[PDB]
């Protein structure tokens, strides 16, 4: 199931208007409180007018609207289920502006929802752009509109939430398709559940930021239910999705052909492991006792030989947390970062940090404990870790809880500074820690090197939406300060994701995936950071990268760019992938620019591919006002 975020508005005084209605299936049968009566657009002898079809509700007075729900016809007939759709709000009834929500609902008779940030309105319009199975009609048995207890304008300067993207699945795993800019998402063998999977199937969905279109398809070609996997973008530009519900399978997503290709089986069955791309483009993984059984030492994927090779001396024991549930949880979601000379740094969640090595049959060396002058940091299962300055080896870690479940989260946060593999990194506390203790939260590094932190809950109860944290935070390293941003209204805890979009906004979605529970979130929202807004709250003018000398570069190589205005800073941000709070693909390189004069600039990609990990990267430039360009895609090879 799912649920609205608000409380249903009384429909006594309501008036409705529809583009077309068949006798006996009048527009007002969608608001009569009877599940057995439905509005249905014109059909039969005199015509079957095709969508878009529209229903507009005049609520008579201004209400603090934060959602709507649609109950499909309940007579066992599929005709008229709404597929692609848009939701619009108005106070006058003539000017509708931009949709507050848009996307595509799954093709079945369950109640569908559009949940979105509170906005005062008297009129609510639902546009059914397509019927879920491509037929001409629209039908609705019951439509409801929901309200928040109050409305508060967003605070100036603290970013903005919206719109909502309605989806046909809960996006519990997601990646950016770097060659197209689309967001790729997947759930499990079904749209709302992973429990009782027979394996061999994953439902996926994609959203195109440039057009707003949502699609969906069924991945079976790789015979892999990809729920609870490792995810890494390898050096050949393919996303390696390892294990999960089909605990030994590997599937490869190719952005260029937008297709899934079978990969080699892993040597060890795993689920909830982290995997990390290495300096040579290979993928290292370790742990993962959610599925498959024993100690899960490391193994390495080679895209050139198409093999997984066991690294049994890359021992998982030093990175286990003290989870009260034991092995099932204690090797999960390692905070892995590819680093110099084939090494992988493990920053947590265990107190003990470790260096993993991939030469020979593998190795592990203690890197000391995550700690500060406030003490030794406790285990932080489902805390996050973000490499916001790869050149200086800077990792920000934050949140999480000592146990996977039934454990209080903390405000702990640290800055880890990596040097050479095998040396114990310096670790300090980050400012005074988070504003809000949270676990199951997600995070992304932004073009300006700040880290955006959102969602989670204060006490980890997977699939329950209790103690939610609605206020995101941004860490600004130059000030060693956290800043609360404007809050959202949708809980984003267990099974949620966040990704940085090429346009510099943040895509935050999912949560739930528990079948009959009411806590499934079939949606995502956009967060627009303050750096995209001017002083009056309007979208700022953005610098444009008018030309680049090349789109593919070897580490140590030079790139020259031309812009339409002078730029004060630039960064490269590696494209991200996300599930279960893990994103081992994103990282940021601040660029040292040579000013060529005439709004022409040059920079060198770092020569160490343990810093500039091979794969796809976003080039962002920022003007003097701090506004970033949209990203230019750069392929980095080694
Ligand atoms: Ca009805
Ligand atoms: Cu899970």
Q: What is the DSSP string of 532-577?
A: GB-TTSSBPPPP-EEEES-SEEETT-EEEEEESS--SEEEEEEPPE
244 with 253: CB under 8 angstroms?
A: no
**Spacing, Cα 273 to ligand 1 middle (Å):** 48
Enzyme catalytic residues = 494
Give the Cα separation of 540 and 546 in Å (integer): 18
Smallest Cα–Cα separation from 479: which of 430, 528, 529, 442?
430
Q: How do 506-510 and 496-500 pair as beta strands?
A: antiparallel
Q: 3-class DSSP state for residue 206? A: strand
Structure letter (DSSP) for residue 592: -
Structure letter (DSSP) for residue 425: P
Burial of 336 (0-12, 13-18, 19+ CB in 10 A): buried
Task: For 333-378, list the strands marked E by DSSP.
Answer: 336-338, 344-346, 352-357, 363-369, 371-372, 375-376
Ramachandran region, residue 247 (left: φ > 0; alpha: ψ -120 to 50; beta: rest): alpha
How many residues belong to the chain?
Answer: 638
Give the Cα separation of 250 and 288 in Å (integer): 14
Q: 3-class DSSP state for residue 28? A: helix
φ and ψ at 309, to 5 degrees?
-120, 130
Other residues' Cβ atoms within 10 Å of the Cβ of residue 490: 24
Q: Is 272 annotated among the ligand-binding residues? A: yes
CA 471 to chain centre: 17
φ and ψ at 27, to 5 degrees?
-50, -40
List of residues 6+ apart from 606 with CB closer than 8 A? 390, 391, 555, 556, 589, 612
| Smallest-distance ligand from the CA of 193 | 2
| Smallest-distance ligand from the CA of 36 | 1
Bridge partners, 131 (sequence order): 82
| Smallest-distance ligand from the CA of 37 | 1
List of residues 6+ apart from 534 with CB closer than 8 A? 540, 541, 625
485 with 158: CB under 8 angstroms?
A: yes
**Spacing, Cα 104 to ligand 2 middle (Å):** 24
| Smallest-distance ligand from the CA of 579 | 2
CA angle in degrees (0–180, nearest 5) for 523-399-194:
40
18 with 53: CB under 8 angstroms?
A: yes
**Spacing, Cα 519 to ligand 2 middle (Å):** 14
List of residues 6+ apart from 401 with CB closer than 8 A? 380, 381, 382, 383, 407, 408, 409, 410, 439, 459, 460
**Spacing, Cα 134 to ligand 1 middle (Å):** 23
Per-residue HEC secondary structure of 222-277 comes to: CCCCCCCCEEEECCCCEEEEECCCCCCCEEEEECCCCEEEECCCCCCCCECCEEEE
Give the Cα separation of 233 and 270 in Å (integer): 18
Give the Cα separation of 536 and 600 in Å (integer): 30
546 with 565: CB under 8 angstroms?
A: no
Q: 3-class DSSP state for residue 220? A: coil
List of residues 6+ apart from 577 with CB closer than 8 A? 173, 174, 175, 176, 231, 232, 233, 239, 499, 583, 584, 585
144 with 68: CB under 8 angstroms?
A: yes
634 with 552: CB under 8 angstroms?
A: yes
φ and ψ at 127, to 5 degrees?
-105, 120
The upper half-sphere exposure of residue 145, i.e. CA atoms within 13 Å in the direction of its Cβ, equals 32
Domains of the chain with bracketed CATH: 7-152 (2.60.120.260), 162-532 (2.130.10.80), 545-637 (2.60.40.10)
List of residues 6+ apart from 46 with CB closer than 8 A? none
Give the Cα separation of 255 and 259 in Å (integer): 7
Smallest Cα–Cα separation from 106: which of 78, 66, 76?
78
Radius of gyration of the chain (CA): 25
φ and ψ at 328, to 5 degrees?
-50, -40
Per-residue HEC secondary structure of 47-59 comes to: CCCCCCEEEEEEE
Ramachandran region, residue 591 (left: φ > 0; alpha: ψ -120 to 50; beta: rest): beta
| Smallest-distance ligand from the CA of 229 | 2
Q: 3-class DSSP state for residue 285? A: strand
Q: After which residues is the chain broken (C to N over 2.5 A)?
A: 293
**Spacing, Cα 33 to ligand 1 middle (Å):** 5
Q: 3-class DSSP state for residue 604? A: strand
Q: How do 451-454 and 473-476 pair as beta strands?
A: antiparallel
Give the Cα separation of 302 and 358 in Å (integer): 12
Give the Cα separation of 329 and 272 in Å (integer): 9
479 with 416: CB under 8 angstroms?
A: no
Resolution in units of Å: 1.6
Give the Cα separation of 547 and 307 in Å (integer): 39
Q: 3-class DSSP state for residue 44? A: coil
**Spacing, Cα 36 to ligand 1 middle (Å):** 6
CA angle in degrees (0–180, nearest 5) for 73-79-83:
90
245 with 194: CB under 8 angstroms?
A: yes
List of residues 6+ apart from 550 with CB closer than 8 A? 559
Q: Is 356 annotated among the ligand-binding residues? A: no
Look at the block and give the residue holding tokens 């063998």: 189
Token pair listed for 523: 């949606």
Containing H/E element for 329? Answer: helix 327-330
**Spacing, Cα 271 to ligand 2 middle (Å):** 9
Q: Is 580 annotated among the ligand-binding residues? A: yes
**Spacing, Cα 39 to ligand 1 middle (Å):** 7
Give the Cα separation of 203 and 186 in Å (integer): 6
Smallest Cα–Cα separation from 398: which of 361, 365, 445, 358?
445
CA 13 to chain centre: 40
**Spacing, Cα 29 to ligand 1 middle (Å):** 4
CA angle in degrees (0–180, nearest 5) for 115-116-117:
145
Give the Cα separation of 371 and 425 in Å (integer): 11
**Spacing, Cα 173 to ligand 2 middle (Å):** 10
Four-point Cα dihedral 547, 549, 552, 553, nearest 10: -130
Smallest Cα–Cα separation from 496: which of 522, 515, 475?
522
Smallest Cα–Cα separation from 389: which of 499, 472, 477, 281?
477
Give the Cα separation of 602 and 562 in Å (integer): 9
List of residues 6+ apart from 161 with CB closer than 8 A? 117, 154, 486, 487, 488, 489, 525, 526, 527, 528
| Smallest-distance ligand from the CA of 140 | 1
Give the Cα separation of 308 and 311 in Å (integer): 10
């Amino acid at each position: 199931a799912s649920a609205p975020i608000g409380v249903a508005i009384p429909r006594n005084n309501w008036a409705v208007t529809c583009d077309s209605a068949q006798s006996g299936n009048e527009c007002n049968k969608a608001i009569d409180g009877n599940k057995d009566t439905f509005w249905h657009t014109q059909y039969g002898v005199n015509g079957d007018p095709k969508p878009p079809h529209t229903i507009t509700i005049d609520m008579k007075t201004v209400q603090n609207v934060n959602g709507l729900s649609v109950l499909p016809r309940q007579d066992g007939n599929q005709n008229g289920w709404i597929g692609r759709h848009e939701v619009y709000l108005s106070s006058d009834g003539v000017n509708w502006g931009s949709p507050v929500a848009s996307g595509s609902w799954f093709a079945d008779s369950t109640t569908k929802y559009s949940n979105f940030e509170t906005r005062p309105a008297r009129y609510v319009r639902l546009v059914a752009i397509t019927e879920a199975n491509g037929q001409p009609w629209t039908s609705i048995a019951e439509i409801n509109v929901f309200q928040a207890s109050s409305y508060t304008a967003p605070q100036p300067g603290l970013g903005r939430w919206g719109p909502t993207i309605d989806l046909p699945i809960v996006p519990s795993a997601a990646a950016i398709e770097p060659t197209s800019g689309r967001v790729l998402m997947w759930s499990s063998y079904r749209q709302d559940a992973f429990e009782g999977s027979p394996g061999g199937i994953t439902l996926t969905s994609s959203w195109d930021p440039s057009t707003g279109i949502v699609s969906d398809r069924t991945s079976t070609v790789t015979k892999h239910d990809m729920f609870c996997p490792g995810i890494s973008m390898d050096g050949n530009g393919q996303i390696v999705v390892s294990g999960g519900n089909d605990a030994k399978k590997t599937s490869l997503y190719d952005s260029s052909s937008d297709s899934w290709i079978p990969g080699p089986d892993m040597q060890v069955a795993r689920g909830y492991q982290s995997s990390a791309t290495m300096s040579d483009g290979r993928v290292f993984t370790i742990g993962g006792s959610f599925s498959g059984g024993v100690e899960k030492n490391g193994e390495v994927y080679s895209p050139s030989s198409k093999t997984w090779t066991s690294l049994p001396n890359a021992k998982v024991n030093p990175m286990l947390t003290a989870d009260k549930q034991g092995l099932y949880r204690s090797d999960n979601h390692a905070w892995l970062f590819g680093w110099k000379k084939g090494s992988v740094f493990q920053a947590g969640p265990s107190t003990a940090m470790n260096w993993y090595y991939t030469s020979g049959s593998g190795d592990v060396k203690s890197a000391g404990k995550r700690q500060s002058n406030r003490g030794v940091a406790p285990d932080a299962m489902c805390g996050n870790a973000v490499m916001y300055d790869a050149v200086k080896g800077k990792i920000l870690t934050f949140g999480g809880s000592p146990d996977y479940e039934d454990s209080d989260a903390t405000t702990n946060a640290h800055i880890i500074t990596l040097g050479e593999p095998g040396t114990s990194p310096n670790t300090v506390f980050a400012s005074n820690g988070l504003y809000f203790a949270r676990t199951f939260h997600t995070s992304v590094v932004l073009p300006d090197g700040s880290t955006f932190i959102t969602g989670g809950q204060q006490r980890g109860i997977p699939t329950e939406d209790s103690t939610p944290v609605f206020t995101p935070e941004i860490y600004v390293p130059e000030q060693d300060t956290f800043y609360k941003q404007n809050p959202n209204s949708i809980v984003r805890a267990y099974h949620s994701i966040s990704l940085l979009l090429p346009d510099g906004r943040v895509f935050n979605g999912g949560g739930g995936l528990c079948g009959d529970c009411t806590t499934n979130h079939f949606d995502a929202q956009i967060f627009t950071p303050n750096y995209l807004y001017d002083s009056n709250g309007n979208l700022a003018t953005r610098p444009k990268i008018t030309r680049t000398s090349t789109q593919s570069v070897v580490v140590g190589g030079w790139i020259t760019i031309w812009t339409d205005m002078s730029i004060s800073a630039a960064s490269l941000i590696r494209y991200g992938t996300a599930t279960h709070t893990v994103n081992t693909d994103q990282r940021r390189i601040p660029l040292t620019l040579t000013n060529n004069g005439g709004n022409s600039y040059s920079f060198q990609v770092p020569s160490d591919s343990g810093v500039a990990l091979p794969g796809y990267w976003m080039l962002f430039v920022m003007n003097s006002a701090g506004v970033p360009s949209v990203a230019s895609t750069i392929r980095v090879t080694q």
